[PDB]
Structure 1
Amino acid sequence: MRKQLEEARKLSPVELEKLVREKKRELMELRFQASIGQLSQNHKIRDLKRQIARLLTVLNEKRRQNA
């Protein structure tokens, strides 16, 4: 989903902020999932981490670029 890469690029302020916050939370969800479905979940976890990692890398890009 380098496409997600794009959406990332797109957002920015309290935007990217709240977006990453929520998503991270979703990953919490995952963590709890640690003992349920799990099977197709694997990705959701590794990746999800990765993706929020993206969000982050971005905020750095964005506001650091700013100041």
Structure 2
Amino acid sequence: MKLSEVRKQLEEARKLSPVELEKLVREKKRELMELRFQASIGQLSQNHKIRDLKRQIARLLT
């Protein structure tokens, strides 16, 4: 159900959407990178956070 929530917000992200959407994706990707480092160092993170983050970006990326 995570989908409907964000995706609805995403056109809702039309205050300066395309621009705001880039800012957003950009932010997300940083989070993900921190996450890659998280999982990288080992003792840290628990999977899906990355899988869900990737998808969220793919949606965002529209």
TM-score by length of 1: 0.60
Moved over 4 A (4+): 1-11, 36-40
How far is 1:12 from its partner? 1.6
What SS is found at the alignment partner of 1:47?
helix
Aligned length: 57
Specify the SS of the correspondent of 1:22. Answer: helix
SS at match of 1:10: coil
Q: Encode CA deviations 1:6-63: one digit per residue, 9 max, x unaligned.
A: 6567872210010110011100011001145767621110010000011003xxxxxx
Percent identity over the alignment is 98
CA distance in 2, matches of 1:3, 1:39: 31
Aligned to 2:41: 36
TM-score (norm 2): 0.64
8 and 50 in structure 1: CA distance in 2 versus 1, 3 angstrom threshold: farther
Where structure 1 has 5 or more consecutive residues not aligned to the other structure, the ranges are 58-67
Asked which structure has the greater RCO (Cα within 8 Å, sep 6+), the reply is 1
Q: Secondary structure at the match of 2:17?
A: coil
CA RMSD of aligned residues (A): 3.0
